[PDB]
Amino acid sequence: PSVFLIDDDRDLRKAMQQTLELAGFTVSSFASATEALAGLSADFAGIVISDIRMPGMDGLALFRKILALDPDLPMILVTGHGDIPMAVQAIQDGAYDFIAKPFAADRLVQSARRAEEKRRLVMENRSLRRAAEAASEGL
Amino acid sequence: PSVFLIDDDRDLRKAMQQTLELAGFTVSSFASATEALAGLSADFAGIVISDIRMPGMDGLALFRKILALDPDLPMILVTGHGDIPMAVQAIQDGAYDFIAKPFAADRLVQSARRAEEKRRLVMENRSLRRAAEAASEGL
């Protein structure tokens, strides 16, 4: 499983990366949503975990960009208590889930695992449909 | 989307059922986990939402029974603050997610929708594999 992790808090990002890696995830951490987005595509087999607030492109801006690329590429928003209402609205808008700070390591893991599961199922579904069409065309 | 809803609190169960129905779910509500389990099978296309505590078969007992029937049939546990640690352990054990009481209607909806999404993808995956094998055998 893979994760693109974005947060402006250097220390929090490192703690989050270590937790995810020890949980079996391959993590790519970024200090900027823009840099992270550059590596994303509808072919990305992982998930995105981003703070809702960033000094540059914020978390919701990144979310909208991801939604356009592939609505089934899960985005988990990391948020402070004050912004929870915004995160809840984002979920209604298509975001996968949110995790409120401060959060426990095992909780970050359970949230990421649910998102990875959705992405794994979506990619498996697409792979199966590709095979069906490939077989159908051959015949 | 369908949901098997189990809770001992008659009033809470009715409020939950109304919220889910207004969110587009077809709901079957039960006052006993035993009665609910009787209608479940690996063919069930919906999800289960159960209180972790019940005077008879409790929520974790129902969870273990469901896990045996089909680990991919999502179970969401409804829990009081005091039992959250037990719910977290249940998730580590295979449960889908948990919702803490008191909870807002829109939050119950977002949790149920994520679970329904997993089940929908799982059933679609199985349907596709069935078709592939059916085609392969015919040829």
Residue boundaries of the structural domains of chain A: 1-139
Cα–Cα distance for residue pair A30/A7, rounded to 1 Å = 7
Resolution as reported, in Å = 1.7
Cα–Cα distance for residue pair A6/A95, rounded to 1 Å = 15
This entry's atomic model was obtained through: X-ray
Beta-strand pair A47-51/A2-6: parallel
DSSP state of B55: S
- Chain A CB within 8 Å of residue B72 CB: no
In chain A, which residue's Cα lies nearest the Cα of B133? A132
Contacts of A125 in chain B (CB under 8 A): 121, 124-125, 128
The vertex-B64 CA angle with B32 and B17, nearest 5°, equals: 40
C-alpha to C-alpha distances, A74 to A17, A46, A55, A64, B58, nearest whole angstrom: 18, 8, 22, 12, 33
Secondary structure of residue B77 in the 3-state scheme: strand
CB B72 within 8 A of CB B41: no
Cα–Cα distance for residue pair B84/B78, rounded to 1 Å = 9
Mutation choice for A interface testing from B111, B114, B129 by most A CBs within 10 A? B114
Other Cβ atoms less than 10 A from the Cβ of B106: the count is 14
Q: Which CATH class is domain B1-139?
A: alpha beta
Tokens of B56: 């008879």
Other Cβ atoms less than 10 A from the Cβ of A113: the count is 17
Tokens of A104: 């426990």
